[PDB]
Design a protein around this motif. Structure first.
Motif, PDB file in Angstrom:
ATOM      1  N   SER A   1       0.843  -1.199   0.000  1.00 39.44           N
ATOM      2  CA  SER A   1       0.000   0.000   0.000  1.00 39.44           C
ATOM      3  C   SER A   1       0.877   1.248   0.000  1.00 39.44           C
ATOM      4  CB  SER A   1      -0.941   0.025   1.204  1.00 39.44           C
ATOM      5  OG  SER A   1      -0.244   0.399   2.376  1.00 39.44           O
ATOM      6  N   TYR A   2       0.318   2.353  -0.500  1.00 46.91           N
ATOM      7  CA  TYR A   2       1.000   3.643  -0.543  1.00 46.91           C
ATOM      8  C   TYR A   2       0.300   4.689   0.323  1.00 46.91           C
ATOM      9  CZ  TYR A   2      -2.316   3.885  -4.507  1.00 46.91           C
ATOM     10  OH  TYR A   2      -3.413   3.786  -5.320  1.00 46.91           O
ATOM     11  N   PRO A   3       1.022   5.717   0.761  1.00 44.49           N
ATOM     12  CA  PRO A   3       0.482   6.673   1.732  1.00 44.49           C
ATOM     13  C   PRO A   3      -0.222   7.849   1.062  1.00 44.49           C
ATOM     14  CG  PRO A   3       2.798   7.085   1.445  1.00 44.49           C
ATOM     15  CD  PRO A   3       2.439   5.987   0.466  1.00 44.49           C
ATOM     16  N   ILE A   4      -0.674   8.781   1.897  1.00 43.96           N
ATOM     17  CA  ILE A   4      -1.427   9.952   1.460  1.00 43.96           C
ATOM     18  C   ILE A   4      -0.492  11.152   1.449  1.00 43.96           C
ATOM     19  CG2 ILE A   4      -3.366  11.462   1.915  1.00 43.96           C
ATOM     20  CD1 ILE A   4      -4.650   9.089   3.418  1.00 43.96           C
ATOM     21  N   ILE A   5      -0.365  11.789   0.291  1.00 46.98           N
ATOM     22  CA  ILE A   5       0.545  12.917   0.111  1.00 46.98           C
ATOM     23  C   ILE A   5      -0.063  13.853  -0.924  1.00 46.98           C
ATOM     24  CG2 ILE A   5       2.757  13.597  -0.854  1.00 46.98           C
ATOM     25  CD1 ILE A   5       3.905  11.042   0.478  1.00 46.98           C
ATOM     26  N   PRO A   6      -0.752  14.917  -0.509  1.00 47.94           N
ATOM     27  CA  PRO A   6      -1.482  15.733  -1.490  1.00 47.94           C
ATOM     28  C   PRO A   6      -0.592  16.648  -2.312  1.00 47.94           C
ATOM     29  CG  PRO A   6      -1.793  16.616   0.698  1.00 47.94           C
ATOM     30  CD  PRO A   6      -0.980  15.369   0.873  1.00 47.94           C
ATOM     31  N   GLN A   7       0.592  16.998  -1.821  1.00 44.16           N
ATOM     32  CA  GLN A   7       1.500  17.879  -2.543  1.00 44.16           C
ATOM     33  C   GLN A   7       2.512  17.041  -3.314  1.00 44.16           C
ATOM     34  OE1 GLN A   7       0.664  20.727  -3.056  1.00 44.16           O
ATOM     35  NE2 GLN A   7      -0.954  20.582  -1.507  1.00 44.16           N
ATOM     36  N   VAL A   8       2.809  17.452  -4.545  1.00 43.87           N
ATOM     37  CA  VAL A   8       3.634  16.660  -5.450  1.00 43.87           C
ATOM     38  C   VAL A   8       5.059  16.554  -4.924  1.00 43.87           C
ATOM     39  CG1 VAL A   8       4.474  16.435  -7.798  1.00 43.87           C
ATOM     40  CG2 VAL A   8       2.194  17.345  -7.374  1.00 43.87           C
TER      41      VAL A   8
ATOM     42  N   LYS B   1      -3.855  10.912  -9.389  1.00 39.30           N
ATOM     43  CA  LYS B   1      -5.302  10.823  -9.260  1.00 39.30           C
ATOM     44  C   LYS B   1      -5.935  10.444 -10.597  1.00 39.30           C
ATOM     45  CE  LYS B   1      -7.402  14.395  -9.127  1.00 39.30           C
ATOM     46  NZ  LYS B   1      -8.194  15.653  -9.117  1.00 39.30           N
ATOM     47  N   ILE B   2      -7.044   9.704 -10.533  1.00 37.98           N
ATOM     48  CA  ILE B   2      -7.498   8.964 -11.709  1.00 37.98           C
ATOM     49  C   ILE B   2      -8.289   9.818 -12.695  1.00 37.98           C
ATOM     50  CG2 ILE B   2      -9.743   8.164 -10.952  1.00 37.98           C
ATOM     51  CD1 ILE B   2      -8.970   5.395 -12.022  1.00 37.98           C
ATOM     52  N   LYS B   3      -8.385  11.130 -12.492  1.00 36.21           N
ATOM     53  CA  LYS B   3      -9.028  11.940 -13.521  1.00 36.21           C
ATOM     54  C   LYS B   3      -8.018  12.557 -14.476  1.00 36.21           C
ATOM     55  CE  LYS B   3     -11.025  15.775 -12.483  1.00 36.21           C
ATOM     56  NZ  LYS B   3     -11.984  16.656 -11.763  1.00 36.21           N
ATOM     57  N   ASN B   4      -6.735  12.523 -14.130  1.00 36.37           N
ATOM     58  CA  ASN B   4      -5.667  13.015 -14.983  1.00 36.37           C
ATOM     59  C   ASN B   4      -5.163  11.962 -15.957  1.00 36.37           C
ATOM     60  OD1 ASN B   4      -5.786  15.341 -13.351  1.00 36.37           O
ATOM     61  ND2 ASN B   4      -4.322  14.430 -11.921  1.00 36.37           N
ATOM     62  N   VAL B   5      -5.937  10.916 -16.207  1.00 35.65           N
ATOM     63  CA  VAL B   5      -5.506   9.779 -17.013  1.00 35.65           C
ATOM     64  C   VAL B   5      -6.440   9.667 -18.213  1.00 35.65           C
ATOM     65  CG1 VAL B   5      -5.115   7.316 -17.079  1.00 35.65           C
ATOM     66  CG2 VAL B   5      -4.555   8.595 -15.031  1.00 35.65           C
ATOM     67  N   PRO B   6      -5.927   9.690 -19.439  1.00 34.72           N
ATOM     68  CA  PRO B   6      -6.803   9.582 -20.611  1.00 34.72           C
ATOM     69  C   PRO B   6      -7.498   8.230 -20.685  1.00 34.72           C
ATOM     70  CG  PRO B   6      -4.490   9.516 -21.237  1.00 34.72           C
ATOM     71  CD  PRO B   6      -4.530   9.949 -19.816  1.00 34.72           C
ATOM     72  N   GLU B   7      -8.420   8.104 -21.639  1.00 35.96           N
ATOM     73  CA  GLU B   7      -9.109   6.837 -21.839  1.00 35.96           C
ATOM     74  C   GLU B   7      -8.251   5.883 -22.654  1.00 35.96           C
ATOM     75  OE1 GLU B   7     -10.522   9.751 -22.298  1.00 35.96           O
ATOM     76  OE2 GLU B   7     -12.266   9.830 -20.961  1.00 35.96           O
ATOM     77  N   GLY B   8      -8.417   4.589 -22.393  1.00 34.99           N
ATOM     78  CA  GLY B   8      -7.608   3.560 -23.007  1.00 34.99           C
ATOM     79  C   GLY B   8      -6.290   3.291 -22.319  1.00 34.99           C
TER      80      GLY B   8
ATOM     81  N   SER C   1     -10.400   2.745  -3.880  1.00 36.42           N
ATOM     82  CA  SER C   1     -11.820   3.025  -4.050  1.00 36.42           C
ATOM     83  C   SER C   1     -12.399   4.020  -3.055  1.00 36.42           C
ATOM     84  CB  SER C   1     -12.632   1.726  -3.961  1.00 36.42           C
ATOM     85  OG  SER C   1     -12.370   1.044  -2.748  1.00 36.42           O
ATOM     86  N   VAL C   2     -11.634   4.496  -2.075  1.00 41.84           N
ATOM     87  CA  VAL C   2     -12.206   5.323  -1.019  1.00 41.84           C
ATOM     88  C   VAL C   2     -11.346   6.567  -0.821  1.00 41.84           C
ATOM     89  CG1 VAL C   2     -13.092   5.278   1.357  1.00 41.84           C
ATOM     90  CG2 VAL C   2     -13.007   3.175   0.015  1.00 41.84           C
ATOM     91  N   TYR C   3     -10.376   6.773  -1.702  1.00 37.77           N
ATOM     92  CA  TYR C   3      -9.438   7.879  -1.538  1.00 37.77           C
ATOM     93  C   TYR C   3      -8.701   7.813  -0.207  1.00 37.77           C
ATOM     94  CZ  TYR C   3      -7.095  12.277  -1.751  1.00 37.77           C
ATOM     95  OH  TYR C   3      -6.120  13.245  -1.789  1.00 37.77           O
ATOM     96  N   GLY C   4      -7.785   6.867  -0.067  1.00 33.67           N
ATOM     97  CA  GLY C   4      -6.936   6.842   1.103  1.00 33.67           C
ATOM     98  C   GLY C   4      -6.709   5.457   1.657  1.00 33.67           C
TER      99      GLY C   4
ATOM    100  N   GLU D   1     -11.631  10.890  -7.761  1.00 34.67           N
ATOM    101  CA  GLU D   1     -10.591  11.314  -6.842  1.00 34.67           C
ATOM    102  C   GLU D   1      -9.712  10.170  -6.366  1.00 34.67           C
ATOM    103  OE1 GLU D   1     -10.862  14.558  -6.980  1.00 34.67           O
ATOM    104  OE2 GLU D   1     -12.712  14.075  -8.050  1.00 34.67           O
ATOM    105  N   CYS D   2     -10.103   8.924  -6.615  1.00 30.57           N
ATOM    106  CA  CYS D   2      -9.265   7.796  -6.243  1.00 30.57           C
ATOM    107  C   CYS D   2      -7.976   7.808  -7.051  1.00 30.57           C
ATOM    108  CB  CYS D   2     -10.017   6.487  -6.468  1.00 30.57           C
ATOM    109  SG  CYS D   2     -11.732   6.506  -5.921  1.00 30.57           S
ATOM    110  N   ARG D   3      -6.900   7.338  -6.435  1.00 28.39           N
ATOM    111  CA  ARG D   3      -5.583   7.335  -7.047  1.00 28.39           C
ATOM    112  C   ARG D   3      -5.276   5.970  -7.652  1.00 28.39           C
ATOM    113  NH1 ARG D   3      -2.080   9.106  -2.107  1.00 28.39           N
ATOM    114  NH2 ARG D   3      -3.659   7.879  -0.987  1.00 28.39           N
TER     115      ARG D   3
END
Length: 232
Positions: free
Chosen positions: A24-31, A88-95, A103-106, A146-148
RNA sequence: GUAGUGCAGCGCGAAUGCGGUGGUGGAUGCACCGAAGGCUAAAUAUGGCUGAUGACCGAUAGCGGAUAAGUAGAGUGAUUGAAGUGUGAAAAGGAGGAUGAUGAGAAAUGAAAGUGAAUGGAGUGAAUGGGGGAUGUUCCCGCCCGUCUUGAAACACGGACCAAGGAGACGACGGCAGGAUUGUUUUCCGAGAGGGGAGGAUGCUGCGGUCGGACCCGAAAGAUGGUGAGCUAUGUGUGUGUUGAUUGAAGGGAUGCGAAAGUGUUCUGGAGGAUCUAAGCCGUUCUGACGUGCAACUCGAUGGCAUGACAUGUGCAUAGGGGCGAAAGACCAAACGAACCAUCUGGUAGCUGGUUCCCUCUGAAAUGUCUCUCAGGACAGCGGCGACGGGUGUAAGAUGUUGUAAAGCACUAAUGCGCUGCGUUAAACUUUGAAGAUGUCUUUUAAGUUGUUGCCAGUGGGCAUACUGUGGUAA
RNA sequence: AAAUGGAAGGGAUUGAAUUGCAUUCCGAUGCCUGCGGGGGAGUAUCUGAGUAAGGGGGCGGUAUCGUUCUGCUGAAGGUCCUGCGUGAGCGGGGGUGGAGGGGCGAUAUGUGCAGAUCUUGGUAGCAGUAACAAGGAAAUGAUUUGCGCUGGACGAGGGUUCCCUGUGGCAGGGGUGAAUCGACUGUGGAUACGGAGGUGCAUUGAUAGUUGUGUGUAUUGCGGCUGGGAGGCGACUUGGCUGUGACGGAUGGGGGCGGCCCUGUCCAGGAUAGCAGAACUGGAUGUCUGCUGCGGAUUGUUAUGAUGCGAAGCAGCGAUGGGCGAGCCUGUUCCGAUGAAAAAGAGGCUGCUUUGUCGUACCUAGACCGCAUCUGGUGUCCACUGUUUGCCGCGGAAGUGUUUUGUGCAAGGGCCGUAAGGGAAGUCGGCAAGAUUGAUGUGUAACUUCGGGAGAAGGAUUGGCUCUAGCGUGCUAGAACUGUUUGUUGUGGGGAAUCUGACUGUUUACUAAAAACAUAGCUUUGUGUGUGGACGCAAAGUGAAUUCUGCCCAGUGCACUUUUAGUUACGGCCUGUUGGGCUAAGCGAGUGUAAACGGCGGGAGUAACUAUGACUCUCUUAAGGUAGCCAAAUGCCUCGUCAUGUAAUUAGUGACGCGCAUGAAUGGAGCAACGAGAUUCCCACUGUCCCUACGGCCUGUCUUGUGAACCUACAGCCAAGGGAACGGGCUUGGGCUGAUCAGCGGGGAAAGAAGACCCUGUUGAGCUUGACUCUAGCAUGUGUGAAGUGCUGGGUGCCCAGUGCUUUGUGGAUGGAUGUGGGGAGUUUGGCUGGGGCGGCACGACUGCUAAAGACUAACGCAGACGUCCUAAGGCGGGCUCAGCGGGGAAGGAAACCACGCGUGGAGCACAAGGGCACAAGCCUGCUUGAGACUGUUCCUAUUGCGGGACUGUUUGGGGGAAACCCUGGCCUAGAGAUCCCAUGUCCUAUUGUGCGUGGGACAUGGGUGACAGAAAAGUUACCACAGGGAUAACUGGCUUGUAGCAGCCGAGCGACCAUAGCGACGCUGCUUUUUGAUUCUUCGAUGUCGGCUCUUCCUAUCAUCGCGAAGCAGAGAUUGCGAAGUGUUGGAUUGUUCACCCACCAACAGGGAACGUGAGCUGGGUUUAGACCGUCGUGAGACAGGUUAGUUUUACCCUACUGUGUGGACUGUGCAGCAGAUCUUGAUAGUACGAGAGGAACUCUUGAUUGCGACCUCUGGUGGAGCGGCGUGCCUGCUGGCUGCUGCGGAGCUACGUCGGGA
């Protein structure tokens, strides 16, 4: 009668368990910027595991195909697209293929964590903030946007390309993983141990589809709740 | 406790001239009582300890235990568990032998089974017994007891020999018999509603009945509470073992052929649940040895495997309706298609075995009815022991009943001829019809000389024969 | 005409076994008569067997009360002798003993033994027997010599067994010393893993990394002195910190602790007849993995390689006598397997000081466990040499262990050796043995998954000595010479086919190693989350690859859907007088699914010879077995049919296919490679056999010592008989031998074990399910729980559904209801029966016969019927006559209807059969509901219920008839149901008083138990248990003879003629005990159950051999009969077989009995419990007289029998017992007699053999651990000479494969 093999193999495993390490990976909102310090083998897994180091935290994840020791990756919600790179999974194109999707953001990861697997991003329903994905079994599933996830496929390729070919290879695999080995067929036992039983010839003697709803536990042996049988 | 007698879970959940109860659910009179807070001597129960007693046992008895006995010993463990008393009043004294001393006495008593020595008799016949006679024998008679059985000397079972121990006693409740004391004894019928006078009591001994460990000894099992992975099975932590050879995969070198694509030969290298051999481990055949053994599984020769899905020391995890199993119902401390230890428990047995002194008087049944009844039981029959009490298991004279043997064709059913006779038949044919059986009257016929009732046992596998049937080739 | 020798009871008998007689006699515990004893009886008498069972009178043990006696001047007990009593028992005398003991009456009882595979103790026979021990010697034995192989340390286990002294095993006294050995400390664990610290030398009777000593290392505490920087371009050097602990298998190269070998020199040791260039033994000495600077392109390995990301080379740093290798250094490789964790860091030079607790002796198997001084079992380490690839085998050291007065070897055993000629003829079966074997050239097929098969198969060479050649110096290649021809003094048998499992692996500790189980591969199913996230995790089937895997969803199962039937519980709500509506899942229905469980057809015609049926009709299914394969481990019939292998083939292989009952992941077809799997054949080889012989060692035989057990009613010779139907004992006959020793397996229905097979019991347990009754869990409504709010929908303002939101309860649970539930619990699964089971019902009940002239009377005896039917087919009045025959009448006939004369029932009467009936009981017809309400006596019928009949009475009662009179179901004998509970009617009733929309009773009917005097009830066991049973089966015997075998009588026919030369129909009468049945008398606290092999004896109903008749007998060859049992009657192929069937030989190849002779004689192929496969059957656990494969054979030492032996001279006689030879052939007679011919004998003489019996060793062959020789391995120093191994010849003796021997 006496108690059947299925029920005793379950009791042996609460006494002496098989243990895996919970990636598992941790929570880090800043790049931030990570550092792959090692890629290593593990007992009972087929996939190699990567050790990644952040500024104040280390994590264990499934390594993607295309990682190497000393490589730099970025973590954060708005991170760029590249093999590795928890984002985060909205910055990913389709395909595009991803792995270790939560599934729960965290929660770390939930989906696609075994040898050579991935999920597919199919649609971004921008209203309502929903993303349709395909998980490894084929079921389609909408998660929040928002899930990663991690970009790429899991390393470890096609392990079934090579046949087992020999008794001793199946012996070493079942020692590490905990399968029943060897399996005596139920029709070769005496009636005292198995619902398939004795008889002057080896034969099951009654239908091998049994119900999944309303019958005694310890009657559910064979093909449980089967919709259909046959070759094709 | 019969339609809550009492108790509990879950849910609902009261009253203030008010509440509870009255052997059938509910109503209403009358009767009788005050729950949901607290304490309380005496008269009752009972391992062990201490006093006092006894128609109790006397060393195979009595407590397992009269002594260095819960000891010696057995089992991994929980547990299990014996055998053994005696010099004398006094040590006055002995303990290889012999010779002696002390003492009232060499010293508790000292049976049978069995043996040694001497001496009398007999024998070459298995022995032993009874009658009759004799200091062994000569004649006659005589198969081994107990038991089950229609039936045993049995090629039916128990019994080598001797001693001691060893099985219908005791309690409760009822009946009868015999006996003791006393006698001015009795709540009746009926589901009820209703109706309405008729010699025992209390002990003592014996026998029959029922429940009690129940005349004595004996199962395969069931349940409650505990012990074990030092043998053996699987998982897991940490250690240890394995000789010398055979075959020759990929990778690499050189060299030849060919227009090319490609390909020949040979070195190097050292793969694989690849082939033997050793340390060693198993267990194919001889159906070898042995078979009251070296041994409750061993010994010889022969054969199989020996880098593994191996072998092995030790820490930990899995326990009995549970475990563990490359699966044979295998293995879980020499018995496993449900381990071992103690208790319930003297578990039940329509079945097998045993059941202890003499003489004397009477003396059966192996059949009928009902039975998850057929190897058993009850009722009736046959027998024993009584008690009380007065008056025919054969014939003759009279008068009824019968449908067999034999015979016959009158009815029913059969059977050949001659054109009225001749011929042949019958458990389910009878026109006839015996011998034999069976009713009644008269002892106002012969000959002879029983009634009423009490308490109870054994028995309910039979077999043979003269004459006479049925089935069967027959026994 | 029958099987051991034998039965008028025996010897015998001519009437001493025949018949007829009585004038005599003998003969019981019975009769008469005299005494004695018991029991009855009314007292002049009469009367005595007895199991099961019952009654009367007596004898004896131990005590009490309660009376009356005795003992030291010698009690009880015990032993011998003696009196009394029908008996149970009671007295006296003499020894012994040394202290107590009795009579009589009542009373209390743990009150009398031959037995119980009885309990405990003691003791016999067997028997001085089985078994075990006796180790090489030398008068002595601290000395000399001969043999065996474990030898030395740590742990577990044991616990004084260790040393000294005294003594015949005990007794008394000693001995274990630690900073530097282990543990007490680390980690979820530990005497083997991690971890502050050492090595030599000497020392005791017994301890030593511990005592003493030479030298070192760590540590407790206490001091003194001293430094925070110098160097090197760099790698790095220095008092100058933050590192390690800490990690798997296989395999190459380099280099070696110790040990061993070769070699130069020096110092010593031991043996020697003689010789030996001077032997033998001991000791002492005799370099680069890496890194840096310069440099600037090549360089290296056994192998893979290294290098402009800096090669070689040069200079540094750091690290560390010759030859056969352990730790160590450095590479390559293998995995869906990647090879623990924690404690423990700081450091310079010096001086003093400290170091706790517990273990420590001895034993690896004669000091441990297995009951023991037990051939078994038990963790780790070290251990020399010749030969050899070998740490194996075959031989030697070191260390360790060991005795010194038993015999010398019959038969039979256990483990081995050699064999003429033949070569599997042996046997279920080549079981067992023999055979091949190392290395190096040569030469190698079918097939095949291309890797293999393969060391295929087949052929050749090998010692010693003296040299040559190569290079890597110990291996390889070549040549001459030599021997009594011979050299590996060890190490796989091979080939051709079929069935089956792919392969390496695993299994029934102690009868099964396999075709069983596992396995990779192939397919199906569930599941979006467990620490685990679908290339995952879990549940089933099939069993490598290759090639394939057809058709059926009607039944059962599983899934989805009920947004278009029905059925259905608590609670709530609704409405109403205590009813009805609304609100679940499940079941039902609809659809899908066979690599779910499973299934996969009959009948008729039809092609120019027959035969068959492409083609057609027809019935029918959910669908009608497809591709393939076969008398196969699957085919009953069956030893199927044809071919092939043999002299001969129930075996094997190939082919055929209507296949009782082949067939597709229930997997079908298929064999490369592999197999201590199952089968058949070929070569080689042999004592498996023909057919046995001789030899070795250990036993046995004989001695001394130590010294058991099993078993035992009493015993121990036979024939027949009868008997509980196979006697050691009983009846009538026949007999060995006076007491020994070694053998042996006929009998003792020998021993062992309360028959496991089979039946019975109202006795169990393992397992199954569609048995009966229940239950954990699971599903689905509903009660309890936390407050506030919005939203959409239902009916009549209403109750409810979802429902979002808010924070301020919480998620842990808990009550009841319906469904499901062999996952689990408890229990049951009748009886009769010519054994049981299947079948039937003789299980309740009616008629005729069996049944023997009153009644009663059996069998799975004979022939039938019953669980109903009827408002008339019941009751009564009246009137009539039926079946059939004869004569008549338009269409009219065999049968239509009218009508006269007769008709004893010859017809009818619900149904089975019997009985009964004519102005009727039958037919027609009128009216009716007696098929009413109550009540008592009696029969079948008894010790007795229910039921079915008969007969009376009483009615404010009927019907029919003028009336007498009849009527309470059916003309008579069958049509039938308790206790308890419920329903309806009549009469009563609930106890403190009264009622009641709440109950209880008496009597009468109905609801039903057919197994019918009346439980609520499915299977399997080959994994099996217990109580019994010869009351009851499966083997032998006994009775029987249908069947089986063997014979007679008659005389119709046949035989060219001719009943009988030879045959003999249709009928009839017997015998045997070899068949198979019938029966159930013996044995279930056990009689070892098929065949073969081996060995003996008996029968005759004679196959051959000897004698002799008949003929449709010319001779030859045969056919049929009588006397006769002395002697013979074989070798092979296929089958487990008996049996059968073929081949070869023969004088001939007969048939039977002896517990279906013979298992302490063998063998174990059939049968054959426990493993497994196939076919059919069953839902299943399982079943099959269906097939196939793997599967413990125990004990004599006793009595008798039998074989020898012993039981005390020499020469002989004579009684008894045994008894042996048999069969074929050559030449002549003779080409003769006989015959038309073809053909073709005999008496007498003569030659050889086969087989049995009894001897013998001259010859020939076998053996020969006696002897001589040859060739080797190790050891004695070599030669000589020895010992040890393999081999040639091999005398004596024994033996056969060799030689000899039969009455007039």
């Amino acid at each position: 009668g006496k108690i059947t093999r299925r029920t005793r193999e379950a009791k042996k495993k609460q006494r002496q368990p098989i243990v895996k390490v919970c990636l598992s990976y941790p929570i880090i909102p800043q790049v931030e910027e990570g550092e792959v310090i090692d890629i290593v083998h593990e007992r009972s897994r087929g996939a190699p595991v990567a050790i990644i180091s952040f500024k104040e935290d280390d994590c264990m994840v499934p390594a993607s195909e295309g990682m190497y020791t000393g490589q730099k990756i970025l973590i954060g919600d708005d991170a760029p697209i590249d093999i590795g790179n928890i984002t985060k999974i909205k910055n990913v194109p389709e395909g595009m293929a991803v792995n270790s999707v939560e599934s729960v953001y965290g929660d770390g990861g939930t989906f696609a964590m075994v040898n050579g697997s991935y999920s597919l991003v199919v649609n971004h329903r921008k209203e309502t903030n929903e993303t349709v994905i395909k998980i490894p079994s084929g079921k389609k599933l909408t998660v929040s946007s928002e899930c990663r996830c991690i970009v790429g496929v899991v390393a470890g390729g096609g392990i079934h390309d090579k046949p087992l070919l020999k008794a001793s290879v199946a012996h070493y695999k079942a020692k590490a993983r905990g399968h029943v080995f060897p399996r005596v067929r139920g029709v070769a036992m005496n009636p005292v141990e198995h619902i398939h039983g004795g008889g002057n010839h080896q034969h099951v003697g009654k239908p091998t589809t049994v119900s999944k709803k309303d019958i005694s536990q310890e009657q559910k042996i064979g093909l449980v709740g089967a919709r259909r049988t046959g070759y094709r």
